Structure formats: C-alpha cells, structure tokens
Design a protein around this nucleic acid. Structure first.
Ligand SMILES: [K+]
Ligand SMILES: [K+]
Ligand SMILES: [K+]
Ligand SMILES: [K+]
Ligand SMILES: [K+]
Ligand SMILES: [K+]
Ligand SMILES: [K+]
Ligand SMILES: [K+]
Ligand SMILES: [K+]
Ligand SMILES: [K+]
Ligand SMILES: [K+]
Ligand SMILES: [K+]
Ligand SMILES: [K+]
Ligand SMILES: [K+]
Ligand SMILES: [K+]
Ligand SMILES: [K+]
Ligand SMILES: [K+]
Ligand SMILES: [K+]
Ligand SMILES: [K+]
Ligand SMILES: [K+]
Ligand SMILES: [K+]
Ligand SMILES: [K+]
Ligand SMILES: [K+]
Ligand SMILES: [K+]
Ligand SMILES: [K+]
Ligand SMILES: [K+]
Ligand SMILES: [K+]
Ligand SMILES: [K+]
Ligand SMILES: [K+]
Ligand SMILES: [K+]
Ligand SMILES: [K+]
Ligand SMILES: [K+]
Ligand SMILES: [K+]
Ligand SMILES: [K+]
Ligand SMILES: [K+]
Ligand SMILES: [K+]
Ligand SMILES: [K+]
Ligand SMILES: [K+]
Ligand SMILES: [K+]
Ligand SMILES: [K+]
Ligand SMILES: [K+]
Ligand SMILES: [K+]
Ligand SMILES: [K+]
Ligand SMILES: [K+]
Ligand SMILES: [K+]
Ligand SMILES: [K+]
Ligand SMILES: [K+]
Ligand SMILES: [K+]
Ligand SMILES: [K+]
Ligand SMILES: [K+]
Ligand SMILES: [K+]
Ligand SMILES: [K+]
Ligand SMILES: [K+]
Ligand SMILES: [K+]
Ligand SMILES: [K+]
Ligand SMILES: [K+]
Ligand SMILES: [K+]
Ligand SMILES: [Mg+2]
Ligand SMILES: [Mg+2]
Ligand SMILES: [Mg+2]
Ligand SMILES: [Mg+2]
Ligand SMILES: [Mg+2]
Ligand SMILES: [Mg+2]
Ligand SMILES: [Mg+2]
Ligand SMILES: [Mg+2]
Ligand SMILES: [Mg+2]
Ligand SMILES: [Mg+2]
Ligand SMILES: [Mg+2]
Ligand SMILES: [Mg+2]
Ligand SMILES: [Mg+2]
Lengths: 194, 101, 82, 212, 97
RNA sequence: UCCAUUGCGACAACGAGCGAGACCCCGGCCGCGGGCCGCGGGACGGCCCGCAGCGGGAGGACGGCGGGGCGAUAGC
RNA sequence: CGAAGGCCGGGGGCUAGAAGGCGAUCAGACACCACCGUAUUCCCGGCCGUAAACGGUGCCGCCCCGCGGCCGGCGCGCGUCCCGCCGGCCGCCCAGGGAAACCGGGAGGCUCCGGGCUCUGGGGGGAGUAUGGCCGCAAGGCUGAAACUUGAAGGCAUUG
C-alpha cells in the first residue's frame, strides 16, 4: 500500500495515448484526453516475477543492465551497486555480444533493458547468442524478441528510479541479503535523476 | 591554416591528464614541461615538442572554463532529509477495484 | 524416446529440445532459442536452492513477441503466478 | 598452446564437455575451430575442395582478380560441414574456406527404408532444400541402391554417412555453390522435423544445461 | 526498365481518367494529378519600395494589396528551373515539404 | 572545418597500417667553443579583442616560417 | 458498349491547328524557334473497333502479425467527442515468397507440388509477312504459314 502511494506520486501508471494489442491485458481504464492507465496490481506481479527470474543466476555479474536514456542513467548504476549486475550505460557499441575482439565484449545470461525502441541494438544482438531478455515496456511497446514485459511509465525520472528501486529491493529480499517485511535503508531518491 | 594532426593531439591529452598539477596555462612553463624525461616524454624533435606544447597550453585553459572526478562521485551519493514524495478520475476506479478505497 | 532398431534399441544420436509453448523442436544453429528458469519460492517468501522450474522457447515464438503472454500462461499453470 | 577467447572454448579445454551432441542439443555457436578439432583428433574429418572461382572487380586502371573457394568436411558417420573463403591468393582462400567449413558442422539424422534390421542406412525421411534458384529432394532408398545423385551431390552425401539415397535436383545446378548450399540446407533441417518417435513430453533439468 | 515508384509518378487513386492542365512555362499538356503545383502569396509592389509607396499615400490606414497565384509546371520545366531536384534512392521516399 | 581521408563530431561496426604530416638540406636572428666552421637556443596559431578552427591588432630577426629532397596501392 | 485520330451525309465556325506558305538558324535544315493558315477540333444521324485501352497483374470462393489516413451507412458510451461493425479507396510492414527489383487487401498459405472455370506462351530472326477466308465505303481489323538463317537475344542486379 505504501509502494502503491509511491507509484501514485511518481505517476508510474500513465501511458502514452497509443496501445499495442499485446499490452491490452495490462490496461484498466482510459483517461478522457486519451492517456491509458495500467492496473498497478499486474505491474507489481510482473515485478515479482522478474525478481524470481533474476535470482536463479548464481553470479549476478553476468546479468547485463542496458539503458541508453539519460533520465535512467543514474538509476542503472545504483541497481548494480546493490545487486552486482553489469551496466552498459551509454551508446551500445555493435559487436559487444557477437565480436570477441571488442574490449568491452561479454557473454551474459540475462539482458535487462529499459526501453524497447531505445536500446534496440542490444535486443537485436542478443538474439544471435541465445540470451533471454526482460524489458521495461510502456503501452506502445513492440515485444519482438522480449520474454518478460513490465508495464510501466518509462519516461519520467521518478517512475524509472522507483521501478529499479523496487526491483533491487525484492531481489535483495529473495536472496536473504536484506530482511523481509522491513523498509530498506536505501531511499528511492538515490535512483532518481536530479 | 595550422591544423594539428592526431599525433599532436593524442600525446597532448595523455600529457595533460598525467601532469595536471605541473602545467600552468602559460606557454614557457609547458615548453619546459614537454622536455623532461622524468615526466617521461620522448619527443624526438624540438619543432614537434613545440607543437605538442602549443596544444597542451590550449588544453589547459579549456578545463578552467582528478579534481572534477572526486566531487562528481562525492555528489552522486547524497540523500536529502526529505523523500520527494511526501486528483484522479480513472485511477480512483482502479484503487477501488484493487484494495481498501 | 526416438527411433528404434528392429530389436528395441534407440539408434538416435541425440534428442532435440521441444518448445514449452508451441511444442516445436529446437534444432541446432537456431541461435534465437532460449532456455530459462524460475525460482519457485515455496518457503516463506524466500527461494530454495537448486529447485527451479525451467522452460524453453524456439526462435519462431520470439520473432513475433508471443512469449510475454505464453510464458505467463505457462506460469499460471505451475503455481508460480496468478 | 591455444588459449580460448570464449567461455565455451574455455569450458571445452577442461573435461566439461563430452561430445558435440551436447553443444547441438543446447544450440550454441562455435567460434573457434580447435573446439571442433578437440572432438575429432587428427583426420577423422575428410576435407575436399569442391570449387575455385575467379571473381573480378572493375577498376579505373584495370580488373582486380580474387579467388573464392568452396570446401566441405565430414567424418562419414553423421557430421557434415560446408564453408567458403575469399582471398587474393588461392592458398589463403582455401584456408579460409576450410576454417568456415569446420565452424559450420551440423548433425545428420539417418533412418530405415522399409526394414529396420541393422544400422540406419538412408535419410530418416524425405528432405528438401533450397539455395538460390536450386532446389533438392532427398528420398529414402532400400539397401544396395547406393547414392543416386550428381557427382557434386554424391560427395556431400558420402561424407555425411548416407549409404542409400535417391535424389532430384531442380534449378540451375551448374551453379556449384548453390547446389552444395541446397544439399547442405536439406541435411541441416533433418533434426527439426517432428516425427511420432519424438512426440513424448519430457522434463527439462537445468543441472545439465551448459549455461550458455 | 523496372518500376521506379509505387505511385507510378502521379497521384491517381480509383479512377480512369483526369483533367488536362497546361504548363505555365512551356505550355505542354499534363494530367492534373501529375503536374507540379505551388501556391504563392506576394505583394504587388516589391518589398524594396514597400515603405516609400506607403509614406507617399494619401489614404489613412491603407494596406498594400497582395497577389494570389497558383503556379503549375511540367516535370521537365520543374527540374530545369529547380522547383524539384533529382534525389537519392532513399531520399525519394520523403514527402516532407 | 583544414593545403590535404587535416581534424572535430556522429555512426553495425570495433581496432590497426601505409600515403599526408612528421623527417633531411639551405637561408634569415642570438649564445658557448675554436680559428669565418661547428655546437646549440629561437616560433608555438604562444599574447590581446570578436565570433576543430575562420577574422582583426601587437611584440619580434622572421607570422602562421620560406625554397628544395623524398615520395602510397594499382597500372600503360 | 468502346479514348483520340479517321470516314459518309447535313449544320456551324471563336480558338488552336496535320497539310501548305513564309522569316531565321545551319556545311545543309525540306526540322526544332517566329509568323500566316486548310482539313480537323463543336452539334445531329450513321460507320470504323483500335491505344503503354496499364495495376504491363483474368473471374468466383476460404485463411491470413500488426500500426495508421480518408469516404458512406449504422450501433454503444460518456459530456462535439470516443469505442466498435459492415462496405470502399490508400500508406507502412513481422512472417512467408522470389533471379532479384520488390509483393505482402498477395506476387503468401506451393518440388511438404491437386478448390472451380476460361484465355495465352514454348531460343532469336524471317513475320504478323505471303496465301486463303470473313468483316469494312475506305483507311483497316480479325484469322495466319513455309522455305531459309543464326549462337545467342532477354530479365533483374554489382563495380567502373
Ligand atoms: K535475430
Ligand atoms: K528491361
Ligand atoms: K517495365
Ligand atoms: K506517370
Ligand atoms: K480519385
Ligand atoms: K479524379
Ligand atoms: K506537386
Ligand atoms: K515533361
Ligand atoms: K559510418
Ligand atoms: K671547432
Ligand atoms: K671546426
Ligand atoms: K611553445
Ligand atoms: K463507340
Ligand atoms: K474511338
Ligand atoms: K475526321
Ligand atoms: K473555325
Ligand atoms: K464551331
Ligand atoms: K490530323
Ligand atoms: K511549317
Ligand atoms: K526533318
Ligand atoms: K530533326
Ligand atoms: K495563326
Ligand atoms: K481530316
Ligand atoms: K470544320
Ligand atoms: K481533339
Ligand atoms: K469546334
Ligand atoms: K471511333
Ligand atoms: K501491347
Ligand atoms: K500505366
Ligand atoms: K479470363
Ligand atoms: K468520413
Ligand atoms: K466514415
Ligand atoms: K462513398
Ligand atoms: K460518412
Ligand atoms: K461514417
Ligand atoms: K466509418
Ligand atoms: K470491415
Ligand atoms: K471491407
Ligand atoms: K474497413
Ligand atoms: K482495397
Ligand atoms: K475468359
Ligand atoms: K489471354
Ligand atoms: K493473350
Ligand atoms: K497471344
Ligand atoms: K493474300
Ligand atoms: K466492302
Ligand atoms: K468502294
Ligand atoms: K471514303
Ligand atoms: K478496299
Ligand atoms: K482492302
Ligand atoms: K486483309
Ligand atoms: K539482357
Ligand atoms: K525483353
Ligand atoms: K531489351
Ligand atoms: K523488354
Ligand atoms: K540480384
Ligand atoms: K545480372
Ligand atoms: Mg458501335
Ligand atoms: Mg486562329
Ligand atoms: Mg489562325
Ligand atoms: Mg490490341
Ligand atoms: Mg491493352
Ligand atoms: Mg494488356
Ligand atoms: Mg480515400
Ligand atoms: Mg484514395
Ligand atoms: Mg493500399
Ligand atoms: Mg497455351
Ligand atoms: Mg489477303
Ligand atoms: Mg484474304
Ligand atoms: Mg544479378
């Protein structure tokens, strides 16, 4: 309920006036001016499911976190800071999963992107070397080569920061690192871009 | 009509990054600074050295307008004393259709 | 099982994986295929080590984006979601 | 000796992987040719040069010439591969073609025409392949029939371990690279066809997965 | 000679025949949906004297009248006088003005 | 943008090399040494204004140093 | 039934304008450019039956990832909008197809080949010619060979 209040302050529940057929299951109503609204319960269930997918991997440094959007850059360096995932902040360089001579080349087991139209090169390249992917998806998202969507508002900084903060909290809960049923010492403000 | 080749520039950047403390933005001191072999720099000619120092002096008076990486890190970790989250027609219909409200 | 000899012995070199969604065989050099696994908590909100569920998806189901709903439906059948 | 540049090649160097069929079962790419050469030590593979072609680029001063080489490899017992290479000198073109041929190894499924007595001796069932304008049909055949194909196709069928086969070819098969490409594609689809022998459902156990 | 454009070089949708216009430069006959069309609004006096007419006018509150002309040219005259350009294969798909 | 595939910056490409430049010879101004020749200093788009670099001033022997040598891949 | 040109018999006659005439240009210009101008262009009653008559794509029927625009009819919703349904005209496009360009409302569901019906083609020339027949006032149209000759013609795409 407290996290619901936080989701309401960040407005993580508002879409972008267009709807795809595969996101139709996550919609609840439509605002008059055309904006769509997500069912927040479904959003939380996708967050929990993604957390339960992340913890199967023994070493977290082989999870890739890719986010080209400036408004998310800060938020992705903190998700790693408490989970020990591997961040690819800026322009994704072609070849990073397919070309072994590259200096930042790697062979991860999960790709976690922020947006499916930004960061398209990572999503397309991961389909050549057997990586599944999880994406933060808005109402107009195209789910090609994506296995788990997360319905959410992926433009405003508060939304993005709170989303990565929730994900990292539930992962640290599931692994046993931080205690269950108790507010994390980390304020979500550390994830939002100033 | 005097464009510096990549060879001048690539050496000038490592010189400015390694020896930030030594280089004032005035040229004679940097001319000496592109001479020492303790700040190790093997410049095989004096015209070449002068061109590199001419670009180094210019790199110096552009960073004024490492000391800018200690503070950038030391400002990415500050949590204020607030929390930054302390009207609806269709979401109300969604909180009624979920929980207490 | 696979193809049998006339006496009852499998004369097959290997058995390809099947899709959890569309039952199609994966096949070698289908580099868009992915196998992935889910935690299956079962214990007061905390996972149990080395006790997972694991599905597989061929490249045909991914190339159109059908996996986000089919994986969810598969999960709702195994008591991992609702 | 060689030092792996990939995690799979690092895993093969130790005793982690027992055969090629585990790498095919979880279908991963192979990026080093000594991964292949570790499983087939010293000449269980046959290597034959199908074709050398001279290609010309027109240029302000005159024609530039290079060579394109087509190479096939196999072990006569269920593996085939096909690569190509382009270079200024013929030797380097052939070298590139042989490397590409080793990185393209695929398994081939065999079966029985009619009686199921001994080892599988023909294609598992009808196979079809396309490359360019060329199309090919591989039809299962009884014992003693042999390899009834053109001399280009008969070598690929010989390296693959297929004793008895019927063949039909349509399109401009004088184009040798598309002929071999079509036959290769037809052999590569053999492990992706559902037959009633494979209908039975199975559990996936993550403990065996080589973890990509 | 393969096909160069999806519209075949004109804008003809669900009809058999359309009207004829005369090119304003060379006077050839062009179908109406193919001719290059531009609309122009300009002042009758050039802007370089637009304030000397105004200051030498007796009528209080006068406003300089305008001219409204629709120019229509054929393909050849449009290319020759640079109303349209020959474009790259990728650029040909762009409809932006 | 530059004399220049000279560079900034962007990019299914990432990273190197050759040609360019750097280099060699000559000549202008100043020092230590010898008895003019032979060893070094000197100039760098360095200073100041106006908008990777285009302009305008200044000092200085010389202002963007000047005249030559060398000279890519492919060819007739 | 059938664009335009064309033909027969009446009418009309502004414009433009095959033919013809004339001024330039040019080595020449019987052409392009300038000027004058007959048939024609328009109406009535007939004839002729052809065009890159084009989407170079026959007709009927089924299935088919999606995102948009416009046109006609209807229905639900709030307070003009908004979401649908049917029918039409368009753009983009995953898969699939293809020699490719490209198609994708098919040019998909096809060497893993079979829903129904009609028409047409079988290397390049000779030749749509000769001959015979039918139609037409004529100009034509429709139907349409053989001897002989030849090693290529042609499609889409790459570098210069
Ligand atoms: K792919
Ligand atoms: K053509
Ligand atoms: K054509
Ligand atoms: K046209
Ligand atoms: K129309
Ligand atoms: K019309
Ligand atoms: K126009
Ligand atoms: K024209
Ligand atoms: K580029
Ligand atoms: K001396
Ligand atoms: K001397
Ligand atoms: K200097
Ligand atoms: K008619
Ligand atoms: K007519
Ligand atoms: K007439
Ligand atoms: K008249
Ligand atoms: K008249
Ligand atoms: K006429
Ligand atoms: K005339
Ligand atoms: K003439
Ligand atoms: K002429
Ligand atoms: K006249
Ligand atoms: K006439
Ligand atoms: K008349
Ligand atoms: K007319
Ligand atoms: K008339
Ligand atoms: K007629
Ligand atoms: K025709
Ligand atoms: K047409
Ligand atoms: K028909
Ligand atoms: K309408
Ligand atoms: K309408
Ligand atoms: K209508
Ligand atoms: K309407
Ligand atoms: K309507
Ligand atoms: K409508
Ligand atoms: K409809
Ligand atoms: K319709
Ligand atoms: K419709
Ligand atoms: K239509
Ligand atoms: K017909
Ligand atoms: K026909
Ligand atoms: K026909
Ligand atoms: K015909
Ligand atoms: K005759
Ligand atoms: K007659
Ligand atoms: K007559
Ligand atoms: K007549
Ligand atoms: K006659
Ligand atoms: K006649
Ligand atoms: K006749
Ligand atoms: K041709
Ligand atoms: K042709
Ligand atoms: K032709
Ligand atoms: K043609
Ligand atoms: K092509
Ligand atoms: K061609
Ligand atoms: Mg008639
Ligand atoms: Mg007249
Ligand atoms: Mg007249
Ligand atoms: Mg005709
Ligand atoms: Mg026609
Ligand atoms: Mg036709
Ligand atoms: Mg319309
Ligand atoms: Mg239309
Ligand atoms: Mg359309
Ligand atoms: Mg026929
Ligand atoms: Mg006759
Ligand atoms: Mg006759
Ligand atoms: Mg071609």
């Amino acid at each position: 309920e407290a996290d619901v209040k936080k989701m309401l302050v960040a407005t993580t529940h508002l879409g972008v006036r267009n709807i795809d057929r595969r996101m139709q299951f996550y919609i609840f109503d439509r605002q008059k001016d055309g904006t769509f609204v997500f069912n927040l319960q479904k959003v939380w269930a996708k967050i929990v499911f993604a957390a339960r997918i992340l913890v199967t991997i023994d070493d977290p440094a082989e999870i890739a976190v890719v986010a080209n959007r400036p408004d998310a850059q800060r938020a992705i360096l903190k998700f790693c800071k408490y989970t020990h995932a591997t961040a690819f902040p800026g322009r994704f360089i072609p070849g990073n999963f397919t070309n072994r001579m590259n200096p930042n080349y790697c062979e991860p087991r999960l790709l976690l992107v922020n947006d499916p139209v930004v960061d398209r090169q990572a999503i397309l390249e991961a389909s050549y070397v057997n990586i599944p992917t999880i994406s933060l998806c808005n109402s107009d998202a195209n789910l090609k080569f994506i296995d788990v969507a997360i319905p959410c508002n992926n433009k405003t900084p508060m939304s993005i920061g709170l989303i990565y903060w929730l994900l990292a909290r539930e992962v640290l809960r599931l692994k046993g690192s931080i205690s269950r049923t108790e507010e994390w010492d980390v304020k979500p403000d550390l994830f939002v871009a100033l | 009509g005097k464009v510096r080749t990549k060879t001048i520039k690539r050496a000038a950047r490592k010189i400015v990054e390694n020896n930030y403390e030594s280089l004032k933005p005035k040229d004679f001191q940097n001319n000496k600074a592109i001479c020492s072999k303790r700040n190790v720099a093997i410049i095989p000619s004096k015209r070449l050295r002068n061109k590199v120092a001419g670009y180094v002096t210019t790199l110096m008076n552009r960073v004024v307008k490492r000391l800018q990486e200690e503070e950038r890190e030391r400002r990415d970790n500050y949590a204020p004393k607030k929390s930054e989250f302390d009207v609806s027609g269709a979401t109300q219909q969604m909180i009624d259709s979920i929980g207490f409200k | 099982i696979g193809m049998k000899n006339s006496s009852g012995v499998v004369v097959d070199a290997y058995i390809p994986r099947k899709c959890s969604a569309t039952n199609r065989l994966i096949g070698p050099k289908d580099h868009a295929a992915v196998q992935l696994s889910v935690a299956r908590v079962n214990d007061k909100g905390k996972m149990i080590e080395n006790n997972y569920v694991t599905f597989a998806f061929c490249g045909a189901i991914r190339s159109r984006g059908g996996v986000d709903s089919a994986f969810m439906l598969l999960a709702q059948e195994h008591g991992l979601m609702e | 000796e060689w030092h792996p540049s990939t995690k799979l090649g690092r895993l093969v160097k130790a005793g982690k992987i027992e055969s090629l069929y585990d790498i095919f079962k979880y279908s991963l790419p192979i990026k080093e040719t000594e991964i292949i050469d570790y499983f087939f030590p010293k000449s269980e593979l046959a290597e034959e040069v199908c074709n050398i072609m001279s290609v010309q680029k027109q240029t302000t001063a005159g024609q530039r010439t290079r060579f394109r080489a087509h190479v096939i490899v196999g072990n006569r017992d269920g593996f085939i591969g096909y690569g190509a290479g382009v270079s200024k000198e013929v030797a380097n073109a052939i070298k590139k073609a042989a490397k590409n041929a080793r990185l393209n190894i695929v398994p081939v499924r065999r079966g029985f025409w009619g009686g199921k007595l001994g080892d599988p001796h023909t294609v598992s069932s009808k196979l079809s392949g396309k490359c360019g304008s060329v199309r090919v049909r591989l039809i299962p055949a009884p014992r003693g029939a042999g390899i009834v194909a053109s001399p280009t196709v008969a070598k690929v069928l010989e390296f693959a371990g297929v004793s008895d086969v019927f063949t039909r070819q349509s399109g401009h098969s004088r184009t040798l690279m598309n002929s071999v490409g079509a036959v290769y594609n037809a052999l590569k689809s053999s492990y992706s066809i559902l037959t009633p022998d494979l209908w039975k459902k199975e559990q996936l156990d993550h403990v065996q997965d080589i973890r990509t | 000679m393969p096909v160069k454009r999806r519209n075949n070089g004109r804008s003809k949708y669900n009809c058999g025949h359309t009207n004829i216009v005369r090119c304003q430069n060379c006077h050839r006959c062009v179908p109406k949906d193919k001719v290059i069309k531009r609309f122009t609004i300009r002042n009758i006096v050039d802007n370089t004297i637009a304030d000397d007419v105004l200051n030498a006018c007796v009528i209080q509150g006068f406003a300089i009248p305008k001219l409204y002309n629709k120019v229509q040219y054929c393909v050849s005259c449009s290319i020759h006088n640079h109303i349209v350009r020959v474009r790259s294969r990728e650029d040909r798909k762009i409809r932006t003005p």
